[PDB]
Coordinates of C-alpha atoms and ligand atoms in Angstrom, one line a residue:
Chain C
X1 CA 111.3 109.3 77.1
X2 CA 113.8 108.6 79.9
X3 CA 114.0 111.9 81.8
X4 CA 111.6 114.8 82.3
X5 CA 112.4 117.5 84.8
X6 CA 112.4 121.2 85.8
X7 CA 115.0 123.3 87.6
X8 CA 115.0 126.9 88.7
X9 CA 117.6 128.2 91.1
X10 CA 115.6 128.9 94.2
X11 CA 112.0 128.2 93.0
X12 CA 111.7 124.5 92.1
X13 CA 113.8 121.5 91.1
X14 CA 112.5 118.0 90.3
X15 CA 113.9 115.4 88.0
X16 CA 111.9 112.3 87.0
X17 CA 114.0 109.3 85.8
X18 CA 111.5 106.8 84.4
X19 CA 113.6 103.7 83.7
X20 CA 113.6 103.0 87.4
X21 CA 110.5 105.2 88.0
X22 CA 112.3 107.5 90.4
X23 CA 111.6 111.1 91.1
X24 CA 114.7 113.0 92.4
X25 CA 113.6 115.9 94.4
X26 CA 110.1 117.3 94.3
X27 CA 109.8 121.1 94.0
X28 CA 106.3 122.5 93.5
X29 CA 104.8 122.0 90.1
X30 CA 105.9 118.3 89.4
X31 CA 102.4 116.9 90.0
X32 CA 100.8 119.6 87.9
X33 CA 103.3 119.1 85.0
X34 CA 103.1 115.3 84.9
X35 CA 99.5 114.8 85.7
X36 CA 98.7 111.1 85.8
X37 CA 102.3 110.1 85.3
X38 CA 102.7 110.6 89.0
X39 CA 100.8 107.3 89.3
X40 CA 103.9 105.6 87.9
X41 CA 106.4 106.7 90.5
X42 CA 107.7 104.0 92.8
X43 CA 110.3 106.2 94.6
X44 CA 111.2 109.7 95.4
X45 CA 114.7 110.4 96.5
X46 CA 115.2 113.8 98.2
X47 CA 118.6 115.4 98.0
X48 CA 117.8 118.0 100.6
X49 CA 115.0 119.5 102.7
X50 CA 114.7 123.0 101.3
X51 CA 111.4 124.3 100.1
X52 CA 112.2 124.3 96.4
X53 CA 113.1 120.6 96.6
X54 CA 110.1 119.1 98.4
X55 CA 107.1 121.4 98.2
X56 CA 105.7 119.5 95.3
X57 CA 105.4 116.3 97.2
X58 CA 102.1 117.1 98.8
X59 CA 100.5 117.3 95.3
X60 CA 102.1 114.1 94.1
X61 CA 100.7 112.2 97.1
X62 CA 97.2 113.8 96.8
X63 CA 96.8 113.2 93.1
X64 CA 97.9 109.6 93.5
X65 CA 95.5 109.0 96.3
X66 CA 92.7 110.5 94.1
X67 CA 93.2 108.6 90.8
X68 CA 95.0 105.3 91.4
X69 CA 91.8 103.9 92.8
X70 CA 91.7 101.3 95.4
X71 CA 94.7 99.8 93.6
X72 CA 97.3 102.2 94.9
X73 CA 100.7 101.1 96.3
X74 CA 102.3 103.4 98.9
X75 CA 105.0 105.8 97.5
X76 CA 108.4 105.4 99.1
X77 CA 110.3 108.6 99.9
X78 CA 114.0 108.8 101.0
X79 CA 115.8 111.8 102.4
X80 CA 119.0 112.3 104.3
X81 CA 118.9 111.3 108.0
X82 CA 118.3 114.1 110.4
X83 CA 116.4 116.5 108.1
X84 CA 113.9 118.2 110.3
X85 CA 112.1 119.8 107.3
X86 CA 111.3 116.5 105.6
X87 CA 110.1 114.9 108.8
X88 CA 107.9 117.8 109.8
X89 CA 106.5 118.2 106.2
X90 CA 105.7 114.5 106.0
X91 CA 104.1 114.6 109.4
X92 CA 102.1 117.7 108.5
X93 CA 100.7 116.1 105.3
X94 CA 99.3 113.0 107.1
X95 CA 98.1 115.2 110.0
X96 CA 96.4 117.6 107.6
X97 CA 95.1 114.9 105.3
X98 CA 94.3 111.7 107.2
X99 CA 93.1 110.2 103.9
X100 CA 96.8 110.3 102.9
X101 CA 98.2 108.5 105.9
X102 CA 98.7 105.4 103.7
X103 CA 99.5 107.0 100.4
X104 CA 103.2 107.1 101.2
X105 CA 106.0 106.1 103.6
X106 CA 109.2 108.0 104.4
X107 CA 112.6 106.6 105.1
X108 CA 115.8 108.2 106.5
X109 CA 119.0 107.3 104.8
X110 CA 122.6 107.6 105.9
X111 CA 125.6 108.3 103.7
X112 CA 126.8 105.3 101.7
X113 CA 123.6 103.4 102.5
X114 CA 122.3 101.3 99.6
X115 CA 118.7 100.8 98.6
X116 CA 117.7 97.9 96.5
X117 CA 115.3 98.8 93.8
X118 CA 114.6 95.7 91.8
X119 CA 116.1 92.8 89.8
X120 CA 115.5 93.1 86.1
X121 CA 117.3 92.2 82.8
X122 CA 119.4 89.9 84.9
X123 CA 120.6 92.6 87.2
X124 CA 120.1 94.1 90.7
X125 CA 119.6 97.9 90.7
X126 CA 120.5 100.1 93.6
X127 CA 120.4 103.7 94.6
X128 CA 123.1 105.0 96.9
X129 CA 123.6 108.4 98.5
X130 CA 126.9 110.0 98.8
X131 CA 127.5 113.2 100.8
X132 CA 127.9 116.4 98.7
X133 CA 130.7 119.1 99.1
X134 CA 126.3 122.5 108.4
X135 CA 123.4 121.0 106.4
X136 CA 123.6 117.3 105.3
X137 CA 123.0 117.2 101.5
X138 CA 123.0 114.1 99.4
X139 CA 123.9 113.4 95.8
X140 CA 122.8 110.0 94.4
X141 CA 124.1 107.1 92.3
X142 CA 122.0 104.5 90.5
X143 CA 124.1 101.4 89.8
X144 CA 123.7 97.8 88.6
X145 CA 125.6 95.0 90.2
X146 CA 127.4 93.2 87.4
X147 CA 130.2 90.6 87.0
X148 CA 133.0 91.5 84.7
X149 CA 138.3 84.1 89.8
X150 CA 134.6 83.3 90.6
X151 CA 134.2 86.2 88.1
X152 CA 134.4 89.5 90.0
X153 CA 131.4 91.8 90.6
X154 CA 131.4 95.5 90.1
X155 CA 129.1 98.5 90.2
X156 CA 127.9 99.9 86.9
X157 CA 127.0 103.6 87.5
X158 CA 123.9 104.1 85.4
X159 CA 123.2 107.6 86.7
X160 CA 124.6 110.2 89.1
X161 CA 122.7 113.2 90.4
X162 CA 124.7 115.8 92.4
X163 CA 122.1 117.8 94.2
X164 CA 123.3 121.2 95.5
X165 CA 127.1 121.0 95.5
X166 CA 130.5 122.0 94.1
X167 CA 132.1 120.2 91.2
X168 CA 132.2 116.6 92.5
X169 CA 135.6 114.9 92.7
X170 CA 136.2 112.9 89.5
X171 CA 136.3 109.7 91.7
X172 CA 132.7 110.0 92.7
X173 CA 131.8 110.6 89.1
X174 CA 134.2 108.3 87.2
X175 CA 132.2 105.7 85.4
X176 CA 128.9 107.5 85.2
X177 CA 126.8 106.6 82.2
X178 CA 124.9 109.9 82.8
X179 CA 125.9 112.8 85.0
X180 CA 123.2 115.3 86.1
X181 CA 125.3 118.1 87.7
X182 CA 124.2 121.3 89.3
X183 CA 125.6 124.3 87.6
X184 CA 124.4 127.5 89.4
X185 CA 127.2 130.0 88.7
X186 CA 128.7 130.5 85.3
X187 CA 131.7 132.2 86.9
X188 CA 132.0 133.9 90.4
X189 CA 130.2 132.4 93.4
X190 CA 129.0 134.0 96.6
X191 CA 128.4 126.9 98.1
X192 CA 127.4 126.0 94.5
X193 CA 129.6 124.9 91.6
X194 CA 130.8 127.0 88.6
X195 CA 130.6 125.4 85.1
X196 CA 134.4 125.7 84.6
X197 CA 134.7 123.6 87.7
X198 CA 132.2 121.0 86.6
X199 CA 133.6 120.4 83.1
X200 CA 137.0 119.9 84.6
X201 CA 135.9 117.0 86.7
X202 CA 134.0 115.6 83.7
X203 CA 137.3 115.5 81.7
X204 CA 139.2 113.9 84.6
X205 CA 136.5 111.3 84.9
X206 CA 136.1 110.7 81.2
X207 CA 132.4 111.1 81.3
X208 CA 130.7 111.4 78.0
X209 CA 127.2 112.7 78.8
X210 CA 126.2 115.4 81.2
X211 CA 123.1 117.3 82.0
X212 CA 123.7 120.6 83.8
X213 CA 120.8 121.9 86.0
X214 CA 119.8 124.4 88.6
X215 CA 120.9 127.3 86.5
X216 CA 120.6 130.9 87.5
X217 CA 117.9 132.6 85.5
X218 CA 120.3 135.4 84.8
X219 CA 123.0 133.4 83.0
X220 CA 120.3 132.5 80.4
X221 CA 121.3 134.3 77.3
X222 CA 125.0 133.8 78.1
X223 CA 124.3 130.1 78.8
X224 CA 123.2 129.1 75.3
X225 CA 126.6 130.4 74.2
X226 CA 128.9 128.9 76.8
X227 CA 127.6 125.5 76.1
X228 CA 128.2 125.7 72.3
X229 CA 131.6 126.8 73.5
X230 CA 132.3 123.8 75.8
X231 CA 130.6 121.3 73.4
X232 CA 133.5 122.2 71.0
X233 CA 136.3 122.0 73.6
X234 CA 135.3 118.4 74.5
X235 CA 133.9 117.1 71.1
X236 CA 133.2 113.6 72.5
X237 CA 131.2 114.6 75.5
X238 CA 127.5 115.3 75.1
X239 CA 126.5 118.3 77.2
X240 CA 122.9 119.2 77.8
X241 CA 121.2 121.6 80.2
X242 CA 117.9 122.4 81.9
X243 CA 116.8 125.8 80.9
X244 CA 115.4 127.5 84.0
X245 CA 112.4 128.6 82.0
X246 CA 111.2 125.3 80.5
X247 CA 110.4 121.8 81.3
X248 CA 113.4 119.6 80.2
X249 CA 112.9 116.4 78.3
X250 CA 115.1 113.6 77.0
Chain O
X1 CA 93.3 146.1 84.7
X2 CA 95.8 143.2 84.8
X3 CA 95.5 139.5 85.7
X4 CA 97.9 136.5 85.6
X5 CA 96.6 133.2 86.8
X6 CA 96.6 129.5 86.4
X7 CA 93.9 126.9 87.2
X8 CA 93.7 123.2 86.6
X9 CA 91.1 121.2 88.5
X10 CA 92.6 119.2 91.3
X11 CA 96.2 120.2 90.6
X12 CA 96.7 124.0 91.1
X13 CA 94.7 127.2 91.1
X14 CA 95.9 130.7 91.8
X15 CA 94.8 134.1 90.5
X16 CA 96.7 137.3 90.8
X17 CA 94.8 140.6 90.5
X18 CA 97.5 143.2 89.9
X19 CA 95.3 146.3 90.3
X20 CA 95.0 145.8 94.1
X21 CA 98.1 143.6 94.6
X22 CA 96.0 140.6 95.6
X23 CA 96.7 136.9 95.1
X24 CA 93.5 134.8 95.2
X25 CA 94.3 131.2 96.2
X26 CA 97.8 129.9 96.0
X27 CA 98.2 126.5 94.3
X28 CA 101.7 125.2 93.5
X29 CA 103.9 126.9 90.9
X30 CA 102.7 130.5 91.5
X31 CA 106.0 131.7 92.8
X32 CA 107.9 129.8 90.1
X33 CA 105.7 131.4 87.4
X34 CA 105.7 135.0 88.8
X35 CA 109.2 135.2 89.9
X36 CA 110.0 138.6 91.5
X37 CA 106.4 139.7 90.9
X38 CA 105.7 137.9 94.2
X39 CA 107.5 140.9 96.0
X40 CA 104.5 143.1 95.0
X41 CA 101.9 141.0 96.7
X42 CA 100.2 142.9 99.6
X43 CA 97.4 140.4 100.3
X44 CA 96.5 136.7 99.7
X45 CA 92.9 135.7 100.1
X46 CA 92.2 132.0 100.3
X47 CA 88.9 130.6 98.9
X48 CA 89.3 127.2 100.4
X49 CA 92.0 125.0 102.0
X50 CA 92.6 122.1 99.7
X51 CA 96.2 121.3 98.5
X52 CA 95.7 122.7 95.1
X53 CA 94.6 126.0 96.6
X54 CA 97.4 126.7 99.0
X55 CA 100.5 124.6 98.6
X56 CA 102.2 127.4 96.7
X57 CA 102.1 129.7 99.7
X58 CA 105.3 128.3 101.1
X59 CA 107.1 129.2 97.9
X60 CA 105.6 132.7 97.8
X61 CA 106.6 133.4 101.4
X62 CA 110.1 131.9 101.0
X63 CA 110.9 133.8 97.8
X64 CA 109.8 137.1 99.4
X65 CA 111.7 136.8 102.6
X66 CA 114.8 135.9 100.6
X67 CA 114.5 138.8 98.2
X68 CA 112.8 141.5 100.3
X69 CA 114.8 143.6 102.8
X70 CA 114.5 144.3 106.6
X71 CA 111.6 146.7 106.9
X72 CA 110.0 144.1 104.6
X73 CA 106.3 144.3 104.8
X74 CA 104.6 141.1 106.2
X75 CA 102.2 139.4 103.7
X76 CA 98.7 139.1 105.1
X77 CA 96.9 135.9 104.5
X78 CA 93.1 135.5 105.0
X79 CA 91.2 132.3 104.9
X80 CA 87.7 131.0 105.8
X81 CA 87.8 130.7 109.6
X82 CA 87.6 127.1 110.5
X83 CA 89.9 125.4 107.9
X84 CA 92.4 123.4 109.9
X85 CA 94.5 122.8 106.8
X86 CA 95.5 126.5 106.5
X87 CA 96.5 127.0 110.1
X88 CA 98.4 123.7 110.2
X89 CA 100.2 124.4 106.9
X90 CA 101.0 127.9 108.2
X91 CA 102.3 126.5 111.4
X92 CA 104.3 123.9 109.5
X93 CA 105.9 126.7 107.5
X94 CA 106.9 128.8 110.4
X95 CA 108.2 125.8 112.5
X96 CA 110.2 124.1 109.7
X97 CA 111.7 127.4 108.7
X98 CA 111.7 130.0 111.6
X99 CA 113.2 132.6 109.3
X100 CA 109.7 132.9 107.9
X101 CA 108.0 133.3 111.2
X102 CA 107.4 137.0 110.8
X103 CA 107.6 137.1 107.0
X104 CA 103.8 136.7 106.9
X105 CA 100.6 136.5 109.0
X106 CA 97.5 134.5 108.7
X107 CA 94.0 135.8 109.6
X108 CA 90.7 133.8 109.8
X109 CA 87.5 135.4 108.4
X110 CA 83.8 134.9 109.1
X111 CA 81.2 135.3 106.3
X112 CA 80.6 139.0 105.9
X113 CA 83.7 140.3 107.6
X114 CA 85.2 143.2 105.6
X115 CA 88.9 143.8 105.0
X116 CA 90.1 147.3 104.2
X117 CA 92.6 147.7 101.4
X118 CA 93.5 151.4 100.9
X119 CA 92.4 154.9 99.8
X120 CA 93.3 156.3 96.5
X121 CA 91.8 158.4 93.7
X122 CA 89.3 159.6 96.3
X123 CA 87.9 156.1 97.1
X124 CA 88.4 153.2 99.5
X125 CA 88.2 149.6 98.6
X126 CA 87.3 146.5 100.6
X127 CA 87.3 142.8 100.2
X128 CA 84.4 140.9 101.7
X129 CA 83.7 137.1 101.6
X130 CA 80.5 135.2 101.2
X131 CA 79.8 131.5 101.7
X132 CA 79.0 129.2 98.7
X133 CA 83.4 125.8 104.4
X134 CA 84.4 127.6 101.2
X135 CA 84.5 131.4 100.4
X136 CA 84.0 133.5 97.3
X137 CA 85.1 137.2 97.3
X138 CA 84.0 140.7 96.3
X139 CA 86.3 143.6 95.9
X140 CA 84.1 146.7 96.3
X141 CA 84.9 150.4 96.4
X142 CA 83.0 152.9 98.5
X143 CA 81.7 155.9 96.5
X144 CA 79.1 158.6 97.3
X145 CA 76.5 159.8 94.7
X146 CA 71.8 163.2 96.8
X147 CA 74.7 162.0 99.1
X148 CA 73.9 158.3 99.4
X149 CA 77.1 156.2 99.7
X150 CA 77.1 152.9 97.7
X151 CA 79.3 149.9 97.3
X152 CA 80.7 149.3 93.8
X153 CA 81.5 145.7 93.0
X154 CA 84.8 145.9 91.1
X155 CA 85.4 142.1 91.2
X156 CA 83.8 138.9 92.3
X157 CA 85.5 135.5 92.6
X158 CA 83.7 132.3 93.3
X159 CA 86.0 129.5 94.2
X160 CA 85.0 125.8 94.2
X161 CA 81.2 126.2 94.2
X162 CA 78.1 126.1 92.0
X163 CA 76.7 129.0 90.0
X164 CA 76.1 132.0 92.2
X165 CA 72.7 133.7 92.9
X166 CA 72.6 136.6 90.5
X167 CA 72.0 138.9 93.5
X168 CA 75.4 138.0 95.0
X169 CA 77.0 138.8 91.6
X170 CA 74.6 141.7 90.8
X171 CA 76.5 144.6 89.2
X172 CA 80.1 143.3 89.3
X173 CA 82.5 144.8 86.9
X174 CA 84.2 141.4 86.5
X175 CA 83.1 137.9 87.3
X176 CA 85.6 135.0 87.8
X177 CA 83.5 131.8 88.1
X178 CA 84.6 128.2 88.4
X179 CA 83.4 126.2 85.4
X180 CA 83.9 122.4 85.8
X181 CA 78.6 124.3 88.4
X182 CA 77.6 123.6 84.8
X183 CA 78.3 126.4 82.2
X184 CA 74.6 126.9 81.6
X185 CA 74.2 127.2 85.4
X186 CA 76.7 130.0 85.4
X187 CA 75.8 131.7 82.1
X188 CA 72.1 131.8 82.9
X189 CA 73.0 133.4 86.2
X190 CA 75.2 135.8 84.2
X191 CA 72.4 136.7 81.7
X192 CA 70.3 137.2 84.9
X193 CA 72.7 139.4 86.8
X194 CA 73.5 141.7 83.9
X195 CA 77.2 141.0 84.2
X196 CA 79.2 142.1 81.1
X197 CA 82.6 140.4 81.5
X198 CA 83.3 137.0 82.9
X199 CA 86.3 134.6 83.2
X200 CA 85.7 131.0 83.8
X201 CA 88.2 128.7 85.5
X202 CA 88.9 125.5 87.3
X203 CA 88.1 123.7 84.1
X204 CA 88.8 120.0 83.4
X205 CA 91.5 119.0 80.9
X206 CA 88.8 116.7 79.7
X207 CA 86.6 119.4 78.1
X208 CA 89.2 121.5 76.4
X209 CA 88.7 120.3 72.8
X210 CA 85.0 120.7 73.4
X211 CA 84.5 123.8 75.6
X212 CA 86.1 126.1 72.9
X213 CA 83.0 126.2 70.7
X214 CA 80.7 126.5 73.7
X215 CA 82.0 129.9 74.7
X216 CA 81.9 130.8 71.0
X217 CA 78.2 129.8 70.8
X218 CA 77.6 131.8 74.0
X219 CA 79.5 134.9 72.9
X220 CA 76.8 135.0 70.2
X221 CA 73.7 134.5 72.4
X222 CA 74.9 137.3 74.6
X223 CA 76.9 139.5 72.1
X224 CA 77.2 142.1 74.8
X225 CA 78.9 139.9 77.3
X226 CA 82.6 139.1 77.2
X227 CA 83.4 135.5 78.0
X228 CA 87.0 134.6 78.8
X229 CA 88.2 131.3 80.1
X230 CA 91.5 129.9 81.6
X231 CA 93.0 127.1 79.7
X232 CA 94.1 124.5 82.3
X233 CA 97.0 123.8 80.1
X234 CA 98.5 127.2 80.2
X235 CA 98.9 130.5 82.1
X236 CA 96.2 133.1 81.7
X237 CA 97.0 136.8 81.2
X238 CA 94.7 139.8 80.9
Ligands
ZN1 ZN1 118.8 125.9 95.8
ZN2 ZN1 89.4 121.5 93.8

């Protein structure tokens, strides 16, 4: 029970990573799908300000302010610096519902800027935004600071979410313990990435587990086939995907 | 003739009445669930202004403007005059995304104010609201019978409110009542009004493994009345 999410091209995208109690993006539906689980979120990291990536936030905050009782800690929301939609939306919520003014706080983030989560199991955990490949979009890394000569520290990439983007350069992805990569087009684009393009970076980076999301509803029937295909062309890499028609769970 | 909806107390509630291309209330997920069907919407009537009744509007209006052409027809949105949330949300939508500025229009309604739908089959239909600042709605068609014109209640929808006075529901071909208003409160009014078919909604997830039998026991005390309910755990179709 590590990840539960939903992704549909232009309708809604939200991915809940529970180990660190983080919600990445918040398309409409999230609060309705997870009911009381929304009480467990400690952070929401927005990849972009489009509708289908933040409209579900209002429901998350409302449900939490209703059922967490007097014992409710504010929800921290991060989004890329300079996103007018997030600012206005967040301002609208408080304005519209004054009883929500304290239910959450928002925080602008700049590229490469770390955010310290907590210290557990002997390690410090951080989330860090990297710009995706106009409109500032962010992808995110969740890493642990570890020590492999005082000793030598290093970042252990526990998770990497791409957000809307093209196949990320293997360098940004090398070392991920779990890659959640967008995979809109199964071939010819209109910018979003094509699967051929994503799997290539995967190989170059030697990543062994990948979750493909934000799939076009059309590629459906063809999808279930392309994966079985790829899964066999890279027999050491675990490839999973979020079907545009169902809540994804792992 | 055809209905697809979803209702879960506090989370989301939206009901699409296909016959007259009307969406009643717009909680989150509506556009995700209906996909392209949202292009067919002609009207949206809001019963109230809480989050779970309107937060899905933004998706509805964004999906349409993206998939509907130039001459695109603006979606008309009516709400109970006086609900700051709806105007503020609407304004937020248009400001944050100007491309949607003319994609739809919002109109406040006072209790009793009629809204004209269209004219087909030799009849006109209208939607008219009634208090319960929440609103419920009636979809009536004007027919002449003597030559005395009369209003036929094709549909009645309550919205967050208690059982309705059987006179307000008198002679409706279909009653959609919120059932969190106690069932008896509603059913008694039903048996009183003479209504033959009713769908309950806005039910708690808490009384699912208990409500079942209730409707079963009721469909027996009123073997002539059809009692349908919306399972807050899944989409409802009819
Ligand atoms: Zn998108
Ligand atoms: Zn409610």
